[PDB]
Amino acid sequence: AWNRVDIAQSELFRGDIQWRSFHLEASLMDALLNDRPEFVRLLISHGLSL
Amino acid sequence: TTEKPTDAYGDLDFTYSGRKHSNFLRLSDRTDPA
């Protein structure tokens, strides 16, 4: 929502948190309704199935 | 043990995903690695 990749990439995907699937899918829907191409690329890159 | 020639040699790949097809073979133990 803040449109700041440099926080989310560097603090939430270091590997400390084992993220489940629907935790990513809800955020991807928030990233598709708003206009953030960088977060869409970042969330598909973590092994999600459409 | 009743030994028989196999059937499972695979052009295996994964459903609803982007991975390239994976080559695949079921193999018995005590076989020759050559």
Curated annotation (Swiss-Prot), chain B:
Disruption of the gene: reported phenotype: Mice have fewer dendritic cells in lymphoid organs and impaired migration of dendritic cells is seen.
Tissue and organ distribution: Sino-atrial nodes (at protein level). Widely expressed.
Record localization: Cell membrane; Endoplasmic reticulum; Golgi apparatus
Highest taxon listed in the record's lineage: Eukaryota
Processing and modification events after translation: Phosphorylation by PKC leads to increase the sensitivity to Ca(2+). Sumoylated. Desumoylated by SENP1.
Function text: Calcium-activated selective cation channel that mediates membrane depolarization. While it is activated by increase in intracellular Ca(2+), it is impermeable to it. Mediates transport of monovalent cations (Na(+) > K(+) > Cs(+) > Li(+)), leading to depolarize the membrane. It thereby plays a central role in cadiomyocytes, neurons from entorhinal cortex, dorsal root and vomeronasal neurons, endocrine pancreas cells, kidney epithelial cells, cochlea hair cells etc.
Domain description: TRPM4, is a temperature-sensitive ion channel, it adopts distinct conformations at different temperatures, markedly influencing where and how ligands interact with it. Decavanadate (a positive modulator), ATP (an inhibitor) and Ca(2+) bind to different locations of TRPM4 at physiological temperatures or at lower temperatures.
Record-stated family: Belongs to the transient receptor (TC 1.A.4) family. LTrpC subfamily. TRPM4 sub-subfamily.
UniProt subunit comment: Homotetramer.
Protein name as it appears in the record: Transient receptor potential cation channel subfamily M member 4
Organism of origin: Mus musculus
